[PDB]
């Protein structure tokens, strides 16, 4: 009896459970929100040990049919810690890689930005926001200069992409931290349960976005915020 466990974010775990009703085996898979891209392979109690990129070709009476994608890239549960962002910082996420890219932002003096590779509709997960996990106290007690990439995960954890991981050349496992701020954003940060990164946040569209449109999110700073933010705020309230 095949079992599908769907997360509120749209992703899911699928496969036959053992005598103990656990997602353990060599033919288990995590399926991304597009219900097409998947990581097929060895899992233990739902945890990814060795997942290979695959495509969910079809499903018959709940039984999925996957076919491996060309390549030798395998993925595994690799939750970050306060000092380790990833065991393989240069291994990108396959779902994210087909939906977004980094380029110079259209926003003046905003540095790099995150752009869509495809035209998609509302509520589409586009990118992942992984990073090291630190406390709110550590973040709030330091200079804003060090909090350019900090994003609260919950009441006890803050996700960060500190130097030198803020450079694509040093880290591309996830790219959510590259989305710039806007008071008229086309995306929002949302909770996401990732098979590789574990509990993190993702960037989800609020509406239709076009290919090559810059993805933006409202940083939501208390109206305690950077100067560029306060400047754009005034320029926003006005005009």
């Amino acid at each position: 009896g095949v079992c599908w466990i769907y997360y509120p974010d749209g992703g899911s775990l699928v496969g036959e459970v053992n005598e103990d009703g656990e997602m353990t085996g060599e033919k288990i898979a995590y399926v991304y929100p597009d219900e097409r891209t998947a990581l097929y392979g060895k899992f233990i109690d739902g945890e990814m040990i060795e997942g290979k990129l695959a495509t969910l070709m079809s499903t018959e009476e709940g039984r999925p049919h996957f076919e491996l994608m060309p390549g030798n890239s395998v993925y595994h549960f690799d939750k970050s810690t306060s000092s380790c962002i990833s065991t393989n910082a240069l291994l990108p996420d396959p779902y994210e890689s087909e939906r977004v890219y980094v380029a110079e932002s259209l926003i003046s003096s905003a540095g790099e930005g995150l752009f869509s590779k495809v035209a998609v509709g509302p509520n589409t997960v586009m990118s992942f926001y992984n990073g090291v996990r630190i406390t709110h106290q550590e973040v709030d007690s330091r200079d804003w200069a060090l909090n350019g990439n900090t994003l609260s995960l919950d009441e006890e954890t803050v996700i960060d992409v500190p130097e030198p991981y803020n450079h694509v050349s040093k880290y591309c496992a996830s790219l959510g931290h590259k989305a710039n701020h806007s008071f008229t954003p086309n995306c929002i940060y949302d909770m996401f349960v990732h098979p590789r990164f574990g509990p993190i946040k993702c960037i989800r569209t609020l509406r239709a976005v076009e290919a090559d449109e810059e993805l933006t999110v409202a940083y939501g700073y208390d109206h305690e915020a950077p100067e560029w933010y306060q400047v754009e705020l005034k320029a926003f309230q006005a005009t």
Binding site: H136, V139, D140, R142, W144, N147, T150, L151, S152, V158, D160, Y189, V217, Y219, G220, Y221, D222, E224
Partner: peptide
């Protein structure tokens, strides 16, 4: 307080 100092994070998105």
């Amino acid at each position: 307080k100092r994070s998105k």
